[PDB]
Design a binder for this molecule. Structure first.
Ligand SMILES: Nc1ncnc2c1ncn2[C@@H]1O[C@H](COP(=O)(O)OP(=O)(O)OP(=O)(O)O)[C@@H](O)[C@H]1O
Lengths: 269, 249
């Protein structure tokens, strides 16, 4: 952990990093994960303190030592790839960067199902509707949503039922059920959406969602699918496929839906 | 034009301790039968041992046990500089210990089971770095250098003492062989590679020559470009091929 690493003294932080890398090498095959890598490794022009630069260099040397002689895979977590030092993303050190991104409607549905696996939830939950409604919530946001729904159910049941009767037992707790109203309240009142940047998902708008423009639909289907569905045909001819199209016309004709539908047809973000 | 500059070719005697002859060449050399002939090649590692178990093949290509290619050489087309240096001292004895394929199975003493039947009346005229095959069985195991009581190589004798306490290891030696990046590993910077060559050939390949003259050498090189363009690879290849000592700061 970045805070765990640079929470201690500079020499102590470097010693902790070296000890962690040595333990990972000893336990090969091992995975080194560094969440909040931007905390340890900021931009080189931005890292004000000399201690921070020294820690960055120590991490670089330790991972290079892993590269030359080890069997450890290093993973890192950061808000943005550019927030970390560009020297970190140097070839040999961080060759491949995986964009975790944001979950889509299906992804939010999967996350909610995962978090409700051990949660006794009623039949009115309709998690498909919740996920379709859920926007701006990513992962732990949906986890907090499920936790809020469960806590509201508990505060509705325990705080109003078992007060002076007799001490709580397993029968009352296992009888707890989470309803749709709890999920609605979690969505509305008690959930801060931490997502405000661009959305990267396959849009749910299909061709049936658009009326008319059949010729435009066919032309766009060509220009998009054909380069990606039949690359061999394009390679056979001496023409490079076009990588862009412009939609022009009166506002309100569905250019946005045209883009969404062509993305959905190709199952492309 | 150097007389002892001759190719080396295929070999048939599975024992490395044998080094070939070429009677027309022996007349050129003083090659005597006995312990050793100093056959010199690349990287200073040689295959020095008993001699004259050859002349079965044609001339102009010395027969040298193929196992002295990986050592002392790389591939075919190379050249040997064979010059006798017999009558070496007789120190205690030369190390006995295997390296890779002996822990696989009965180990015992690692000397008196498989290797003992070979240091017989040919008591190891050798040079530390000569690697070969010797066994009392499947006939494929190495014999490497581990210890050195006498710095120069010698001819062993019985009554000596040996300690196989050592353990067979991994291919640290094989990895050592696999190193020293070269110009064959550089691509996309042919003009830059030639510029670097013409900059560093005189200061490195000819140190005393440049010390004779009073010109200023290029002692600072700024390889700048995008990350991952082989800058450290280019530097390592240049230093290794030219023989200059490379320090990776
Ligand atoms: N021009 C090149 N030709 C061949 N291989 C290259 C070239 N550039 C880089 N490589 C290969 O890239 C791999 C990793 O690169 P390496 O560790 O040598 O650093 P580098 O490319 O010199 O880095 P930098 O540009 O940051 O100094 C090595 O296997 C090396 O062989």
């Amino acid at each position: 952990n970045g805070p765990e690493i640079m929470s201690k003294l500079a020499g102590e932080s470097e010693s902790n990093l070296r000890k962690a890398f040595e333990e990972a090498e000893k336990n090969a095959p091992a995975i080194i994960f560094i969440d909040e890598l931007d905390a340890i490794a900021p931009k080189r022009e931005k890292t004000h303190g000399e201690v921070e630069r020294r820690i960055v260099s120590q991490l670089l040397t330790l991972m290079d030592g892993l590269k030359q002689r080890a069997h450890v895979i290093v993973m890192a977590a950061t808000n943005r790839p550019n927030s970390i030092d560009p020297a970190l993303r140097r070839f040999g050190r961080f060759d491949r960067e995986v964009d975790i991104g944001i979950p889509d409607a299906t992804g939010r549905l999967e996350i909610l199902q995962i978090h409700t696996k051990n949660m006794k939830l009623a039949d009115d939950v309709d998690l498909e509707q919740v996920a379709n409604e859920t926007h701006g919530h990513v992962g732990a946001d949906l986890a907090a949503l499920c936790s809020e729904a469960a806590l509201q159910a508990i505060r509705k049941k325990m705080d109003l039922i078992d007060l002076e009767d007799e001490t709580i037992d397993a029968e009352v707790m296992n009888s707890l059920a989470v309803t749709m109203d709890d999920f609605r309240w979690a969505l509305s009142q008690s959930n801060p959406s931490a997502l405000r940047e661009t959305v990267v998902e396959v849009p749910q708008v299909t061709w049936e969602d658009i009326g008319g423009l059949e010729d435009v639909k066919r032309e766009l289907q060509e220009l998009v699918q054909y380069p990606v569905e039949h690359p061999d045909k394009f390679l056979k001819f001496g023409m490079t496929p076009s990588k862009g199209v412009l939609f022009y016309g009166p506002p309100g004709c569905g250019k946005t839906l045209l883009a969404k539908a062509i993305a959905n047809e190709c199952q492309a973000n | 034009n150097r007389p002892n500059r001759l190719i080396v070719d295929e070999a048939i005697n599975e024992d490395n301790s044998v080094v070939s002859l070429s009677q027309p060449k022996m007349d050129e050399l003083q090659l005597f039968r006995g312990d050793t002939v100093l056959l010199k090649g690349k990287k200073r590692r040689e295959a020095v041992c008993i001699v004259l178990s050859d002349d079965t093949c044609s001339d102009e290509k010395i027969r040298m046990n193929r196992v002295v290619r990986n050592n002392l050489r790389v591939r075919l087309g190379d050249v040997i500089s064979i010059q006798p240096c017999p009558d070496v001292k007789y120190g205690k004895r030369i190390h006995v210990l295997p390296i890779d394929d002996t822990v696989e199975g009965i180990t015992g003493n690692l000397f008196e089971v498989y290797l003992k039947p070979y240091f017989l009346e040919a008591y190891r005229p050798i040079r530390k770095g000569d690697i070969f095959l010797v066994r009392g069985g499947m006939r494929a195991v190495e014999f490497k250098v581990v210890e050195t009581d006498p710095s120069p190589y010698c001819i062993v004798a019985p009554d000596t003492v040996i300690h196989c306490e050592g353990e067979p290891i991994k291919r640290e030696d094989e990895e050592e062989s696999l190193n020293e990046v070269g110009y064959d590993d550089i691509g996309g910077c042919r003009k830059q590679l030639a510029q670097i060559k013409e900059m560093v050939e005189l200061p490195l390949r000819h140190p005393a020559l440049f010390k004779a003259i009073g010109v200023k050498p290029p002692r600072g090189i700024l390889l700048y470009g995008p990350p991952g363009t082989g800058k450290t690879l280019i530097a390592r290849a240049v230093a290794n091929e030219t023989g200059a000592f490379f320090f990776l700061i």
